Amino acid sequence: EPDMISVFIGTWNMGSVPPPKNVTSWFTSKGLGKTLDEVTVTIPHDIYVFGTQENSVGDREWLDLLRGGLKELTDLDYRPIAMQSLWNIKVAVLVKPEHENRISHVSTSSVKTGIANTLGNKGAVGVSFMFNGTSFGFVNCHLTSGNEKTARRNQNYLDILRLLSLGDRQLNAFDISLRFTHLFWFGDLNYRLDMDIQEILNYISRKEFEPLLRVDQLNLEREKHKVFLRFSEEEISFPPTYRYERGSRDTYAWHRTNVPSWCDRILWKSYPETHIICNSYGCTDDIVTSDHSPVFGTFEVGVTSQAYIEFESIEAIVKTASRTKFFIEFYSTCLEEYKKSFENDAQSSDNINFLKVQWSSRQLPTLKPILADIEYLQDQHLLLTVKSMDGESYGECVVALKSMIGSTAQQFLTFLSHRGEETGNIRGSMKVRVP
């Protein structure tokens, strides 16, 4: 029935002590940054997702605290659809009672990413599900600490990306960056500021965040295309959330030392031509039990209620030295089974590192969707993987059917990726024809 839903994401490193009794500000996006402080009448969200780190409250008691807090806030009995914990890294997903019958295909997963000669218990936990016909993944993580450990954090990220098993077994050809309509990845990512302490404190007291954001390690690693390929993060207008003295937010704790940093982050990655708007991204300033401040993010998200596809041609530019033949596998929830193309019938290159690979219409199968309703087909997506004939994918991508419905073929162009690396691009011409 609903066209759109409101999704809340919270991330909080709790610093190994229990929460204060009142965490209302976290739930309602009140504090610093892009906030919902103007809102006078709380509009309860459809889904609340809580990711925590250094959470030393027993699992049952923690879930009870959250459910109890939401009950008091909303007067609704929110339904925990899933929880997953790995050491003190814990995620929970709660939904309005009315939505319980809209949820299906729930899975959870965890991944350990321990590095020698460092403090352990790092990794990630995840939950995925369907809300009617739209799929969601949520990843909560705690990555390697330390100013000098950027490379370790990047490897943690890649290991989580590769090993987290959320979602359908058939989507094994893809990693979690392409398994869901909407993927939220958050946690104590532990990336720091490349600047000395007194200089950082100066900019924080001036509320001049741009010079700090320029030396944020996460931003810098994303710019290098090493992590979070084509994810989004809302603009940061709140002060660094680590490391505070407990009992107030007036003073940062300090021993390059453990400099104040945006450790705690929310990013997202969505299928093309979908509706998602970020309505808040911020931190609280009245929750003072931990050396981190809680971070909130909220999102309005489109949801879709639970014929043939013909290509004129496909051309891929693939980052590879191989000169063999290639084919494509096509997957989608709108297909009864996955389909495969024939060998490419043309290829060329004037670059030792790249290859242009082409499939004419003849080399490409028509795909048959399970339902011919225009409104159904508009919300669907195709997942493509480019494979060699000898056989391991060279690149995956997603293509939206939204603008392709009709009699004449339409252009598409998108990026190929594999294991967190950009591996080229793919383009073509296709249509989704209904009788």
Swiss-Prot record:
Function recorded in the entry: Phosphatidylinositol (PtdIns) phosphatase that specifically hydrolyzes the 5-phosphate of phosphatidylinositol-3,4,5-trisphosphate (PtdIns(3,4,5)P3) to produce PtdIns(3,4)P2, thereby negatively regulating the PI3K (phosphoinositide 3-kinase) pathways. Required for correct mitotic spindle orientation and therefore progression of mitosis. Plays a central role in regulation of PI3K-dependent insulin signaling, although the precise molecular mechanisms and signaling pathways remain unclear.
Subunit structure: Interacts with tyrosine phosphorylated form of SHC1. Interacts with EGFR. Upon stimulation by the EGF signaling pathway, it forms a complex with SHC1 and EGFR. Interacts with cytoskeletal protein SORBS3/vinexin, promoting its localization to the periphery of cells. Forms a complex with filamin (FLNA or FLNB), actin, GPIb (GP1BA or GP1BB) that regulates cortical and submembraneous actin. Interacts with c-Met/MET, when c-Met/MET is phosphorylated on 'Tyr-1356'. Interacts with p130Cas/BCAR1. Interacts with CENTD3/ARAP3 via its SAM domain. Interacts with c-Cbl/CBL and CAP/SORBS1.
Disorder noted: Genetic variations in INPPL1 may be a cause of susceptibility to metabolic syndrome. Metabolic syndrome is characterized by diabetes, insulin resistance, hypertension, and hypertriglyceridemia is absent. Opsismodysplasia: A rare skeletal dysplasia involving delayed bone maturation. Clinical signs observed at birth include short limbs, small hands and feet, relative macrocephaly with a large anterior fontanel, and characteristic craniofacial abnormalities including a prominent brow, depressed nasal bridge, a small anteverted nose, and a relatively long philtrum. Death secondary to respiratory failure during the first few years of life has been reported, but there can be long-term survival.
Section of the entire sequence shown: 420 to 875 of 1258
Similarity section: Belongs to the inositol 1,4,5-trisphosphate 5-phosphatase family.
Expression across tissues: Widely expressed, most prominently in skeletal muscle, heart and brain. Present in platelets. Expressed in transformed myeloid cells and in primary macrophages, but not in peripheral blood monocytes.
This protein's name: Phosphatidylinositol 3,4,5-trisphosphate 5-phosphatase 2
Cellular localization per UniProt: Cytoplasm, Cytosol; Cytoplasm, Cytoskeleton; Membrane; Cell projection, Filopodium
Domain remark in the UniProt entry: The SH2 domain interacts with tyrosine phosphorylated forms of proteins such as SHC1 or FCGR2A. It also mediates the interaction with p130Cas/BCAR1.
